């Protein structure tokens, strides 16, 4: 029942706050906050100051040290009337970190106290202008028990400290950069601290401090290393240096999201900090690197230039995601990064864009802004930034970055400001391109071709449309950069030209329908279309199998080779799902299996690329091939396809598995790539002849000298239901039960198991010694993984998965609505399923709609879903 807010309602605030002096008298049960703000009236003389506040106990209100009588509290607010044009506001209020189970505001993480203020959490700390176009200079004094909280941290530099009576002490911090309150942070606790330094290119020496729970210093150096790598890369690639003297990171165990870019004092979920080779996989290492980079990158794209309002979230997030992908891609394998980001787009983001929650990357309407930290705003947002990069090229794109910062450094900006900077600096016209900000849904691009041997011309007829979405009945054509390459019979690229002039290979597809003609095409080409996934679109082209296997062999970009393989598999995934619905077993032409045999035996192919080709689309990517999802058929077909390839390629699989053995473990990209290939081979081998598979898998688990290899073996034992499974699963538990992060991997394998009794096991794990409903990571690794990553069990025909999720959400709605709203997502996809499943999913949603004290977070999603 809160009301929707609308982007078109934006208005400049009636009051600004320029400076705020905060004091916290910290205690888990009762913290007392004193906030002295210097305010200035911009609006009308008679306009009251309206402060946001949630669950605060107001103690006093003074204006220039006069106790104020002209105020009132209303729902979510303190409204203060009859004010001068400039004045000092002082508010004292109380809060209770220990009661804060939602983990928004000031809360408790184990024995630590920490904050999360984005999007609107600072209002849970004191009454404030909790909107990101109000930027203020903060000073923060923190008073606490010295033994319990020996480290008292906030943004910026320490400027004062003292000791008090009765075992208390205090520290005061000042951050010279004006900031919106969402970037405020405070941490209090007892930590081990890893300290290091980075010297910027101009010579600024930056102290780096990573704070971790006592005992975890053995797991901190990789995050420190990645922080230095991120700082170096931002200098080399974007020309950006860190702007303060200290960079602090705190790893906390209780955190709803991944991490948070609070200026000078980032707060991280420990999953994105803590690694050592026996606890963390290669993928953990690269996610640490990604996320460390991402928060660092926000220092410019988010902090030095922030968001005018929350509808502009993608201005920081699309651009910072783009930056983290570029970082990862530059340091590591660009092809593997691009592949993975495309898998995410097509299999997860396209599903959101086809859901009741569909929105443009710059939303128009929001009820609960924490619901809009989405695949769309992030991943599609980054694809839009990448399109700009495609249209401008690197040099002009960097000119646009520089112009963006020159204009907006020190302020809150809009998506439109950013696009204008890019357009003005490059002289590329982005007026049509802007529609990508305002239109939801995934465009479908249909391509037909014609080769004319009399004129040696090749013609592409390209059409686009975006189907209506629930949020938008009106859709219009976009400016779609559509990259192509044309290949002759020997696999060489044909120069693109027309009328004697070269033609850019990025075509501008701007109309509902258009034709493009290329001259001097001396041989009928095989096209590579939408190269490097040049726009976030569904491609419709009538490929032959042979065109696709030809691209798998000859395409110049590794991405195109993988993508061609995906298009080849899509045909046969669809075929086999229809078969499955008719009771018929898997059918695959011999020449398809041969294409994958060729990948395995090709000596020149990068193993990173080979590994991706040999990784089948996930059940989520497979679901996107279909209008109506049959999750049981998809799961069974994926397995049958794995078993068919395991049998047909058994000898080649074992040979490549053995050839990529590595005795040394290194977190190095060539090594990672070999190991990904070897483990991609193991997945198939696990589905071969049982006794061979069992031996191979058990052996890898017991001989692994690193968690990447041990987990790959354990996961294969679960997936193929091998005899060794229960023993290996018990061993892992017995060894790792005290380590939450490591047990998350195990809860995911339990939740995603193909066993017939998976729900009964998942329910039993609610009582496991390593599980707790108080920890978001545990919740997501057991309950989220079941609902979101085991659609076949979640969607069991008896409706048991939906009932289970309802029960869990009934708890989480009151305990932690943000995590609840993450976990409801699979139920809101009901219209993609068959009538009988829809009926049960609607019944489940209607039960949740009637919960007493329904959170705004759930209410928004439930009302869209039931419409
Ligand atoms: Na201000
Ligand atoms: Na001040
Ligand atoms: Na309130
Ligand atoms: Na690279
Ligand atoms: Na054709
Ligand atoms: Na054709
Ligand atoms: Na437990
Ligand atoms: Zn971010």
mmCIF file of N, CA, C and O in Angstrom, residues 724-807:
data_model
loop_
_atom_site.group_PDB
_atom_site.id
_atom_site.type_symbol
_atom_site.label_atom_id
_atom_site.label_comp_id
_atom_site.label_asym_id
_atom_site.label_seq_id
_atom_site.Cartn_x
_atom_site.Cartn_y
_atom_site.Cartn_z
ATOM 1 N N UNK A 724 29.037 -42.723 -5.280
ATOM 2 C CA UNK A 724 29.887 -42.032 -4.299
ATOM 3 C C UNK A 724 29.238 -40.762 -3.703
ATOM 4 O O UNK A 724 29.734 -40.185 -2.735
ATOM 5 N N UNK A 725 28.111 -40.335 -4.222
ATOM 6 C CA UNK A 725 27.549 -39.042 -3.875
ATOM 7 C C UNK A 725 27.350 -38.810 -2.407
ATOM 8 O O UNK A 725 27.828 -37.825 -1.858
ATOM 9 N N UNK A 726 26.656 -39.711 -1.734
ATOM 10 C CA UNK A 726 26.328 -39.481 -0.342
ATOM 11 C C UNK A 726 27.596 -39.430 0.521
ATOM 12 O O UNK A 726 27.703 -38.626 1.416
ATOM 13 N N UNK A 727 28.529 -40.330 0.264
ATOM 14 C CA UNK A 727 29.762 -40.325 1.007
ATOM 15 C C UNK A 727 30.480 -38.985 0.810
ATOM 16 O O UNK A 727 30.984 -38.446 1.764
ATOM 17 N N UNK A 728 30.597 -38.502 -0.426
ATOM 18 C CA UNK A 728 31.391 -37.268 -0.677
ATOM 19 C C UNK A 728 30.695 -36.039 -0.014
ATOM 20 O O UNK A 728 31.337 -35.192 0.592
ATOM 21 N N UNK A 729 29.374 -35.994 -0.110
ATOM 22 C CA UNK A 729 28.592 -34.920 0.456
ATOM 23 C C UNK A 729 28.755 -34.920 1.938
ATOM 24 O O UNK A 729 28.868 -33.836 2.511
ATOM 25 N N UNK A 730 28.734 -36.113 2.585
ATOM 26 C CA UNK A 730 28.934 -36.166 4.032
ATOM 27 C C UNK A 730 30.373 -35.699 4.453
ATOM 28 O O UNK A 730 30.536 -35.004 5.451
ATOM 29 N N UNK A 731 31.356 -36.125 3.715
ATOM 30 C CA UNK A 731 32.702 -35.706 3.934
ATOM 31 C C UNK A 731 32.852 -34.206 3.889
ATOM 32 O O UNK A 731 33.602 -33.637 4.653
ATOM 33 N N UNK A 732 32.263 -33.571 2.889
ATOM 34 C CA UNK A 732 32.365 -32.128 2.790
ATOM 35 C C UNK A 732 31.743 -31.470 3.964
ATOM 36 O O UNK A 732 32.348 -30.568 4.537
ATOM 37 N N UNK A 733 30.504 -31.848 4.326
ATOM 38 C CA UNK A 733 29.874 -31.352 5.520
ATOM 39 C C UNK A 733 30.819 -31.487 6.742
ATOM 40 O O UNK A 733 31.088 -30.532 7.497
ATOM 41 N N UNK A 734 31.284 -32.700 6.994
ATOM 42 C CA UNK A 734 32.113 -32.933 8.201
ATOM 43 C C UNK A 734 33.340 -32.054 8.196
ATOM 44 O O UNK A 734 33.732 -31.593 9.215
ATOM 45 N N UNK A 735 33.904 -31.780 7.040
ATOM 46 C CA UNK A 735 35.070 -30.979 6.991
ATOM 47 C C UNK A 735 34.775 -29.477 7.095
ATOM 48 O O UNK A 735 35.564 -28.738 7.661
ATOM 49 N N UNK A 736 33.678 -29.006 6.471
ATOM 50 C CA UNK A 736 33.517 -27.580 6.221
ATOM 51 C C UNK A 736 32.340 -26.941 6.965
ATOM 52 O O UNK A 736 32.101 -25.737 6.812
ATOM 53 N N UNK A 737 31.631 -27.703 7.795
ATOM 54 C CA UNK A 737 30.354 -27.193 8.419
ATOM 55 C C UNK A 737 30.497 -25.857 9.170
ATOM 56 O O UNK A 737 29.531 -25.109 9.276
ATOM 57 N N UNK A 738 31.702 -25.526 9.652
ATOM 58 C CA UNK A 738 31.921 -24.333 10.410
ATOM 59 C C UNK A 738 32.115 -23.165 9.497
ATOM 60 O O UNK A 738 32.166 -22.086 9.966
ATOM 61 N N UNK A 739 32.270 -23.373 8.206
ATOM 62 C CA UNK A 739 32.547 -22.295 7.305
ATOM 63 C C UNK A 739 31.336 -22.013 6.422
ATOM 64 O O UNK A 739 31.095 -22.717 5.488
ATOM 65 N N UNK A 740 30.613 -20.960 6.746
ATOM 66 C CA UNK A 740 29.383 -20.629 6.048
ATOM 67 C C UNK A 740 29.569 -20.488 4.553
ATOM 68 O O UNK A 740 28.750 -21.016 3.762
ATOM 69 N N UNK A 741 30.597 -19.732 4.137
ATOM 70 C CA UNK A 741 30.793 -19.507 2.731
ATOM 71 C C UNK A 741 31.042 -20.770 1.960
ATOM 72 O O UNK A 741 30.621 -20.928 0.836
ATOM 73 N N UNK A 742 31.797 -21.652 2.537
ATOM 74 C CA UNK A 742 32.069 -22.922 1.853
ATOM 75 C C UNK A 742 30.808 -23.781 1.867
ATOM 76 O O UNK A 742 30.541 -24.484 0.892
ATOM 77 N N UNK A 743 30.047 -23.757 2.957
ATOM 78 C CA UNK A 743 28.824 -24.591 2.996
ATOM 79 C C UNK A 743 27.766 -24.072 2.018
ATOM 80 O O UNK A 743 26.933 -24.847 1.550
ATOM 81 N N UNK A 744 27.790 -22.763 1.682
ATOM 82 C CA UNK A 744 26.878 -22.244 0.656
ATOM 83 C C UNK A 744 26.971 -23.074 -0.614
ATOM 84 O O UNK A 744 25.980 -23.312 -1.256
ATOM 85 N N UNK A 745 28.169 -23.464 -1.036
ATOM 86 C CA UNK A 745 28.341 -24.267 -2.255
ATOM 87 C C UNK A 745 27.594 -25.606 -2.160
ATOM 88 O O UNK A 745 27.032 -26.110 -3.136
ATOM 89 N N UNK A 746 27.629 -26.166 -0.958
ATOM 90 C CA UNK A 746 27.028 -27.464 -0.635
ATOM 91 C C UNK A 746 25.493 -27.342 -0.576
ATOM 92 O O UNK A 746 24.777 -28.199 -1.133
ATOM 93 N N UNK A 747 25.002 -26.270 0.042
ATOM 94 C CA UNK A 747 23.553 -26.021 0.074
ATOM 95 C C UNK A 747 23.076 -25.828 -1.360
ATOM 96 O O UNK A 747 21.997 -26.319 -1.732
ATOM 97 N N UNK A 748 23.865 -25.170 -2.221
ATOM 98 C CA UNK A 748 23.440 -25.016 -3.633
ATOM 99 C C UNK A 748 23.341 -26.374 -4.332
ATOM 100 O O UNK A 748 22.375 -26.641 -5.087
ATOM 101 N N UNK A 749 24.332 -27.256 -4.108
ATOM 102 C CA UNK A 749 24.235 -28.585 -4.722
ATOM 103 C C UNK A 749 23.036 -29.358 -4.168
ATOM 104 O O UNK A 749 22.365 -30.049 -4.930
ATOM 105 N N UNK A 750 22.747 -29.263 -2.873
ATOM 106 C CA UNK A 750 21.552 -29.939 -2.338
ATOM 107 C C UNK A 750 20.295 -29.412 -3.012
ATOM 108 O O UNK A 750 19.425 -30.212 -3.437
ATOM 109 N N UNK A 751 20.176 -28.076 -3.082
ATOM 110 C CA UNK A 751 18.971 -27.394 -3.627
ATOM 111 C C UNK A 751 18.717 -27.667 -5.105
ATOM 112 O O UNK A 751 17.558 -27.655 -5.561
ATOM 113 N N UNK A 752 19.800 -27.875 -5.867
ATOM 114 C CA UNK A 752 19.735 -28.038 -7.274
ATOM 115 C C UNK A 752 19.842 -29.524 -7.657
ATOM 116 O O UNK A 752 20.071 -29.864 -8.813
ATOM 117 N N UNK A 753 19.735 -30.430 -6.685
ATOM 118 C CA UNK A 753 19.977 -31.839 -7.006
ATOM 119 C C UNK A 753 18.854 -32.374 -7.929
ATOM 120 O O UNK A 753 17.680 -31.992 -7.795
ATOM 121 N N UNK A 754 19.184 -33.240 -8.848
ATOM 122 C CA UNK A 754 18.093 -33.899 -9.594
ATOM 123 C C UNK A 754 17.409 -35.056 -8.858
ATOM 124 O O UNK A 754 16.507 -35.660 -9.395
ATOM 125 N N UNK A 755 17.784 -35.383 -7.654
ATOM 126 C CA UNK A 755 17.163 -36.502 -6.969
ATOM 127 C C UNK A 755 15.662 -36.319 -6.780
ATOM 128 O O UNK A 755 15.145 -35.172 -6.585
ATOM 129 N N UNK A 756 14.935 -37.446 -6.811
ATOM 130 C CA UNK A 756 13.452 -37.341 -6.700
ATOM 131 C C UNK A 756 13.055 -36.765 -5.354
ATOM 132 O O UNK A 756 12.026 -36.097 -5.230
ATOM 133 N N UNK A 757 13.868 -36.939 -4.344
ATOM 134 C CA UNK A 757 13.480 -36.456 -3.014
ATOM 135 C C UNK A 757 14.115 -35.097 -2.601
ATOM 136 O O UNK A 757 14.279 -34.796 -1.390
ATOM 137 N N UNK A 758 14.469 -34.304 -3.602
ATOM 138 C CA UNK A 758 15.192 -33.026 -3.317
ATOM 139 C C UNK A 758 14.427 -32.099 -2.393
ATOM 140 O O UNK A 758 14.997 -31.541 -1.489
ATOM 141 N N UNK A 759 13.107 -31.986 -2.500
ATOM 142 C CA UNK A 759 12.404 -31.045 -1.613
ATOM 143 C C UNK A 759 12.406 -31.491 -0.177
ATOM 144 O O UNK A 759 12.624 -30.707 0.762
ATOM 145 N N UNK A 760 12.158 -32.768 0.040
ATOM 146 C CA UNK A 760 12.261 -33.316 1.367
ATOM 147 C C UNK A 760 13.684 -33.039 1.932
ATOM 148 O O UNK A 760 13.841 -32.668 3.092
ATOM 149 N N UNK A 761 14.709 -33.193 1.144
ATOM 150 C CA UNK A 761 16.059 -32.935 1.697
ATOM 151 C C UNK A 761 16.258 -31.468 2.018
ATOM 152 O O UNK A 761 16.799 -31.105 3.077
ATOM 153 N N UNK A 762 15.817 -30.605 1.093
ATOM 154 C CA UNK A 762 15.912 -29.160 1.305
ATOM 155 C C UNK A 762 15.182 -28.730 2.553
ATOM 156 O O UNK A 762 15.664 -27.942 3.334
ATOM 157 N N UNK A 763 13.957 -29.206 2.746
ATOM 158 C CA UNK A 763 13.232 -28.892 3.956
ATOM 159 C C UNK A 763 13.979 -29.308 5.269
ATOM 160 O O UNK A 763 14.004 -28.553 6.244
ATOM 161 N N UNK A 764 14.530 -30.505 5.262
ATOM 162 C CA UNK A 764 15.361 -31.041 6.362
ATOM 163 C C UNK A 764 16.593 -30.171 6.655
ATOM 164 O O UNK A 764 16.890 -29.914 7.809
ATOM 165 N N UNK A 765 17.214 -29.621 5.591
ATOM 166 C CA UNK A 765 18.344 -28.702 5.739
ATOM 167 C C UNK A 765 18.005 -27.383 6.378
ATOM 168 O O UNK A 765 18.902 -26.652 6.819
ATOM 169 N N UNK A 766 16.723 -27.027 6.492
ATOM 170 C CA UNK A 766 16.366 -25.875 7.314
ATOM 171 C C UNK A 766 16.825 -26.032 8.776
ATOM 172 O O UNK A 766 16.955 -25.022 9.473
ATOM 173 N N UNK A 767 17.063 -27.263 9.203
ATOM 174 C CA UNK A 767 17.568 -27.553 10.550
ATOM 175 C C UNK A 767 19.030 -27.887 10.533
ATOM 176 O O UNK A 767 19.591 -28.236 11.572
ATOM 177 N N UNK A 768 19.692 -27.738 9.414
ATOM 178 C CA UNK A 768 21.135 -28.089 9.401
ATOM 179 C C UNK A 768 21.949 -27.142 10.290
ATOM 180 O O UNK A 768 21.703 -25.941 10.365
ATOM 181 N N UNK A 769 22.990 -27.688 10.908
ATOM 182 C CA UNK A 769 23.922 -26.909 11.749
ATOM 183 C C UNK A 769 24.591 -25.728 11.078
ATOM 184 O O UNK A 769 24.916 -24.776 11.742
ATOM 185 N N UNK A 770 24.749 -25.744 9.764
ATOM 186 C CA UNK A 770 25.304 -24.611 9.067
ATOM 187 C C UNK A 770 24.269 -23.643 8.486
ATOM 188 O O UNK A 770 24.677 -22.655 7.850
ATOM 189 N N UNK A 771 22.968 -23.961 8.585
ATOM 190 C CA UNK A 771 21.920 -23.111 7.989
ATOM 191 C C UNK A 771 21.347 -22.158 9.038
ATOM 192 O O UNK A 771 21.193 -22.537 10.149
ATOM 193 N N UNK A 772 21.031 -20.917 8.682
ATOM 194 C CA UNK A 772 20.217 -20.090 9.566
ATOM 195 C C UNK A 772 19.427 -19.100 8.723
ATOM 196 O O UNK A 772 19.964 -18.543 7.755
ATOM 197 N N UNK A 773 18.145 -18.909 9.059
ATOM 198 C CA UNK A 773 17.254 -17.928 8.428
ATOM 199 C C UNK A 773 17.712 -16.490 8.728
ATOM 200 O O UNK A 773 17.234 -15.575 8.112
ATOM 201 N N UNK A 774 18.639 -16.292 9.662
ATOM 202 C CA UNK A 774 19.145 -14.945 10.015
ATOM 203 C C UNK A 774 20.218 -14.434 9.002
ATOM 204 O O UNK A 774 20.617 -13.275 9.084
ATOM 205 N N UNK A 775 20.673 -15.287 8.070
ATOM 206 C CA UNK A 775 21.783 -14.945 7.202
ATOM 207 C C UNK A 775 21.337 -15.021 5.750
ATOM 208 O O UNK A 775 21.034 -16.102 5.229
ATOM 209 N N UNK A 776 21.373 -13.892 5.035
ATOM 210 C CA UNK A 776 20.947 -13.886 3.653
ATOM 211 C C UNK A 776 21.691 -14.840 2.747
ATOM 212 O O UNK A 776 21.104 -15.348 1.810
ATOM 213 N N UNK A 777 23.001 -15.014 2.940
ATOM 214 C CA UNK A 777 23.705 -15.907 2.068
ATOM 215 C C UNK A 777 23.201 -17.343 2.216
ATOM 216 O O UNK A 777 23.054 -18.052 1.223
ATOM 217 N N UNK A 778 23.019 -17.786 3.462
ATOM 218 C CA UNK A 778 22.451 -19.131 3.666
ATOM 219 C C UNK A 778 21.061 -19.295 3.017
ATOM 220 O O UNK A 778 20.760 -20.319 2.350
ATOM 221 N N UNK A 779 20.219 -18.309 3.235
ATOM 222 C CA UNK A 779 18.909 -18.280 2.636
ATOM 223 C C UNK A 779 18.973 -18.402 1.135
ATOM 224 O O UNK A 779 18.270 -19.197 0.525
ATOM 225 N N UNK A 780 19.842 -17.631 0.513
ATOM 226 C CA UNK A 780 19.890 -17.642 -0.919
ATOM 227 C C UNK A 780 20.499 -18.950 -1.445
ATOM 228 O O UNK A 780 20.100 -19.425 -2.513
ATOM 229 N N UNK A 781 21.429 -19.518 -0.694
ATOM 230 C CA UNK A 781 22.122 -20.724 -1.159
ATOM 231 C C UNK A 781 21.261 -21.990 -1.030
ATOM 232 O O UNK A 781 21.453 -22.964 -1.813
ATOM 233 N N UNK A 782 20.276 -21.971 -0.131
ATOM 234 C CA UNK A 782 19.430 -23.166 0.045
ATOM 235 C C UNK A 782 18.074 -22.918 -0.610
ATOM 236 O O UNK A 782 17.665 -23.655 -1.554
ATOM 237 N N UNK A 783 17.367 -21.900 -0.100
ATOM 238 C CA UNK A 783 15.973 -21.646 -0.540
ATOM 239 C C UNK A 783 15.951 -20.978 -1.928
ATOM 240 O O UNK A 783 15.247 -21.412 -2.816
ATOM 241 N N UNK A 784 16.747 -19.946 -2.126
ATOM 242 C CA UNK A 784 16.808 -19.260 -3.424
ATOM 243 C C UNK A 784 17.259 -20.189 -4.544
ATOM 244 O O UNK A 784 16.748 -20.126 -5.606
ATOM 245 N N UNK A 785 18.243 -21.017 -4.284
ATOM 246 C CA UNK A 785 18.771 -21.878 -5.288
ATOM 247 C C UNK A 785 17.713 -22.947 -5.669
ATOM 248 O O UNK A 785 17.580 -23.350 -6.803
ATOM 249 N N UNK A 786 16.950 -23.398 -4.689
ATOM 250 C CA UNK A 786 15.904 -24.344 -4.999
ATOM 251 C C UNK A 786 14.858 -23.749 -5.921
ATOM 252 O O UNK A 786 14.590 -24.280 -6.999
ATOM 253 N N UNK A 787 14.302 -22.613 -5.516
ATOM 254 C CA UNK A 787 13.245 -21.969 -6.298
ATOM 255 C C UNK A 787 13.692 -21.429 -7.645
ATOM 256 O O UNK A 787 12.945 -21.523 -8.617
ATOM 257 N N UNK A 788 14.867 -20.807 -7.675
ATOM 258 C CA UNK A 788 15.389 -20.164 -8.854
ATOM 259 C C UNK A 788 16.261 -21.016 -9.758
ATOM 260 O O UNK A 788 16.278 -20.795 -10.940
ATOM 261 N N UNK A 789 16.990 -21.966 -9.213
ATOM 262 C CA UNK A 789 17.881 -22.766 -10.005
ATOM 263 C C UNK A 789 17.537 -24.234 -10.081
ATOM 264 O O UNK A 789 18.267 -24.978 -10.721
ATOM 265 N N UNK A 790 16.465 -24.672 -9.431
ATOM 266 C CA UNK A 790 15.936 -26.003 -9.709
ATOM 267 C C UNK A 790 14.497 -25.935 -10.233
ATOM 268 O O UNK A 790 13.563 -26.406 -9.585
ATOM 269 N N UNK A 791 14.302 -25.310 -11.405
ATOM 270 C CA UNK A 791 12.861 -25.099 -11.843
ATOM 271 C C UNK A 791 12.091 -26.414 -11.996
ATOM 272 O O UNK A 791 10.885 -26.464 -11.749
ATOM 273 N N UNK A 792 12.778 -27.498 -12.279
ATOM 274 C CA UNK A 792 12.077 -28.721 -12.401
ATOM 275 C C UNK A 792 11.440 -29.224 -11.108
ATOM 276 O O UNK A 792 10.333 -29.781 -11.116
ATOM 277 N N UNK A 793 12.121 -29.032 -9.986
ATOM 278 C CA UNK A 793 11.588 -29.372 -8.697
ATOM 279 C C UNK A 793 10.679 -28.278 -8.117
ATOM 280 O O UNK A 793 9.613 -28.578 -7.495
ATOM 281 N N UNK A 794 11.070 -27.033 -8.334
ATOM 282 C CA UNK A 794 10.276 -25.924 -7.899
ATOM 283 C C UNK A 794 8.861 -26.048 -8.527
ATOM 284 O O UNK A 794 7.827 -25.735 -7.874
ATOM 285 N N UNK A 795 8.860 -26.439 -9.800
ATOM 286 C CA UNK A 795 7.653 -26.574 -10.572
ATOM 287 C C UNK A 795 7.074 -28.002 -10.633
ATOM 288 O O UNK A 795 6.413 -28.350 -11.604
ATOM 289 N N UNK A 796 7.356 -28.800 -9.614
ATOM 290 C CA UNK A 796 6.807 -30.126 -9.495
ATOM 291 C C UNK A 796 5.277 -29.992 -9.661
ATOM 292 O O UNK A 796 4.630 -29.015 -9.213
ATOM 293 N N UNK A 797 4.724 -30.938 -10.369
ATOM 294 C CA UNK A 797 3.312 -30.932 -10.725
ATOM 295 C C UNK A 797 2.330 -30.981 -9.556
ATOM 296 O O UNK A 797 1.261 -30.430 -9.684
ATOM 297 N N UNK A 798 2.723 -31.536 -8.438
ATOM 298 C CA UNK A 798 1.888 -31.492 -7.218
ATOM 299 C C UNK A 798 1.899 -30.121 -6.545
ATOM 300 O O UNK A 798 1.198 -29.929 -5.580
ATOM 301 N N UNK A 799 2.650 -29.125 -7.068
ATOM 302 C CA UNK A 799 2.616 -27.810 -6.451
ATOM 303 C C UNK A 799 3.386 -27.646 -5.123
ATOM 304 O O UNK A 799 3.364 -26.552 -4.513
ATOM 305 N N UNK A 800 4.097 -28.691 -4.698
ATOM 306 C CA UNK A 800 4.857 -28.679 -3.480
ATOM 307 C C UNK A 800 5.934 -27.583 -3.438
ATOM 308 O O UNK A 800 6.236 -27.106 -2.377
ATOM 309 N N UNK A 801 6.516 -27.205 -4.572
ATOM 310 C CA UNK A 801 7.581 -26.222 -4.559
ATOM 311 C C UNK A 801 6.993 -24.861 -4.243
ATOM 312 O O UNK A 801 7.579 -24.115 -3.461
ATOM 313 N N UNK A 802 5.810 -24.579 -4.782
ATOM 314 C CA UNK A 802 5.207 -23.294 -4.557
ATOM 315 C C UNK A 802 4.822 -23.165 -3.063
ATOM 316 O O UNK A 802 5.006 -22.099 -2.471
ATOM 317 N N UNK A 803 4.340 -24.269 -2.445
ATOM 318 C CA UNK A 803 3.902 -24.231 -1.055
ATOM 319 C C UNK A 803 5.069 -24.005 -0.135
ATOM 320 O O UNK A 803 4.967 -23.305 0.879
ATOM 321 N N UNK A 804 6.175 -24.631 -0.475
ATOM 322 C CA UNK A 804 7.414 -24.474 0.296
ATOM 323 C C UNK A 804 7.872 -22.993 0.277
ATOM 324 O O UNK A 804 8.127 -22.359 1.318
ATOM 325 N N UNK A 805 7.904 -22.424 -0.928
ATOM 326 C CA UNK A 805 8.315 -21.025 -1.065
ATOM 327 C C UNK A 805 7.368 -20.103 -0.322
ATOM 328 O O UNK A 805 7.819 -19.167 0.367
ATOM 329 N N UNK A 806 6.046 -20.341 -0.419
ATOM 330 C CA UNK A 806 5.122 -19.543 0.398
ATOM 331 C C UNK A 806 5.478 -19.565 1.890
ATOM 332 O O UNK A 806 5.453 -18.493 2.572
ATOM 333 N N UNK A 807 5.739 -20.726 2.447
ATOM 334 C CA UNK A 807 6.065 -20.788 3.861
ATOM 335 C C UNK A 807 7.321 -19.991 4.173
ATOM 336 O O UNK A 807 7.392 -19.261 5.150
#
